[PDB]
Amino acid sequence: QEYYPNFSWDKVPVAFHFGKRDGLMTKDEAKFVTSRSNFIVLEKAHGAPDYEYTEDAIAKEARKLKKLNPGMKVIFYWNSFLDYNMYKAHEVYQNHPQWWLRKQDGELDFKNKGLKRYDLSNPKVRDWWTDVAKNEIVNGSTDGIFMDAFIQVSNPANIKLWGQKKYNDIQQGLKDLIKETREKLGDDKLIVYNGIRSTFQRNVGNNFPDYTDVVMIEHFGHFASTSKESMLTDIQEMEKAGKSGKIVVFKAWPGFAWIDKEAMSKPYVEKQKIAKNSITFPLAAFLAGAQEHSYFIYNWGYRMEMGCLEWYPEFDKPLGKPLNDMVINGWVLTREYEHALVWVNLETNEAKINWK
């Protein structure tokens, strides 16, 4: 835990996860982020279109943030499944068509807009993929890697496309990729992966605990995880992961997301007002199960302009250390901090934070 970001219970622990379009962060934006958190994940296409390649922009942005805050942990986003076109490594991957994953019917496997999906069962793809992470991170400005799209790899709909045998090899290839990543990165670098996800159809927990330091709860109380059963599972997974020593990133939403076309057409001040009015329930749910090194993120997207730099009075109130563990009473969760008493009813979507 010596290479973890410095954690404190003094106020609500928050983290950042975004990519800024139209160049790197300004000095004011960099000061805002580094003075309020020690933990930021920089997304794909950060700095676009001013920076052609994500590797350059993230490396430069990490240096800028670390000048203001030497204790800042800056994470390099590197999708484990999808071949996005704004990296240098994308050009290398294009020159290896023999690597490209193909479905059962022999057709190339890709998502919409020609986004190829990696064949993680191929050791040559894994060695190239981990080489990209190593060359960017070790002896570099970043302190770790964000391996995304783990859930998409294990999606049972892939068995129809790949067949059971190919699906099993790809699942095992993902496990090897994580182990190879830790081998090349070393012991002093953080490994983040998109983990916990609770839905009616599938429940995914901290299912890759080996060699990893941070697990994300991306979809709390939103998308397909709005049910009381899903929300309780997400909060319990945070509590279980945190008690195991994991950093947990608890991503909450203001009742809407950037994929909502009608909500995105609202005035920005209306988005702020909705977000300001909708923070109590997800924050109380976070504080109910939050452990040491648990972090709260509250916005409506992964581009910086989608509320990522908004601030709320709840984030300035004293919090203090937790005095007890989470108490579950049916669908009602309670937690007591030194300066806050937390109450949340997942069934009725009601919550109250009694600051004191």
Numbering used by the authors: 20 to 375
Question: From the publication, what sentences describe this entry?
Answer:
The genome of the marine bacterium Muricauda eckloniae sp. DK169 contains an extensive polysaccharide-utilization locus that targets fucoidan from brown algae. Within this locus is a gene that encodes a putative fucoidan-degrading glycoside hydrolase (locus tag AAY42_01205) assigned to glycoside hydrolase family 168, which we call MeGH168. In general, the inferred catalytic mechanism of GH168s is a two-step retaining mechanism utilizing two carboxylic acid-containing amino acids as nucleophile and acid–base residues. Fucoidan is a complex polysaccharide that is found in several brown algae species.
We present the 2.0 Å resolution X-ray crystal structure of MeGH168, demonstrating a (β/α)8-barrel fold. MeGH168 crystallized in space group P22121 with unit-cell parameters a = 47.27, b = 120.93, c = 163.85 Å. Analysis using MATTHEWS_COEF showed two protein molecules in the asymmetric unit with a Matthews coefficient of 2.65 Å3 Da−1 and a solvent content of 53.67%. PISA analysis indicated that dimers of the protein are unlikely to form in solution. Additionally, an antiparallel β-sheet fold, consisting of four β-strands, is present in the C-terminal region. The −3 and −4 subsites displayed no ligand interactions as these fucosyl residues did not make direct interactions with the enzyme, making it unclear whether there truly are −3 and −4 subsites; therefore, we opted to omit analysis of these subsites. A comparison of MeGH168 with this structure revealed conservation of the catalytic residues (Asp167 and Glu237 in MeGH168) in structurally conserved loop regions in the central base of the catalytic groove. Based on the retaining mechanism of GH168 enzymes, Asp167 is predicted to function as the nucleophile and Glu237 as the acid/base. However, the loop regions at the back of the catalytic groove have high variability, suggesting some possible contributions to differences in substrate recognition. In particular, an antiparallel β-hairpin in the predicted positive-subsite region of MeGH168 is likely to have a profound effect on reshaping the active site of this enzyme. Similarly, Asn267, His209 and Tyr266, present in the suggested +3 subsite, were not present in MeGH168. The lack of structural and sequence conservation in the anticipated positive subsites of MeGH168, combined with presence of a large β-hairpin loop insertion, suggests that this enzyme may be able to accommodate substrates with alternative chemical characteristics in comparison to Fun168A.
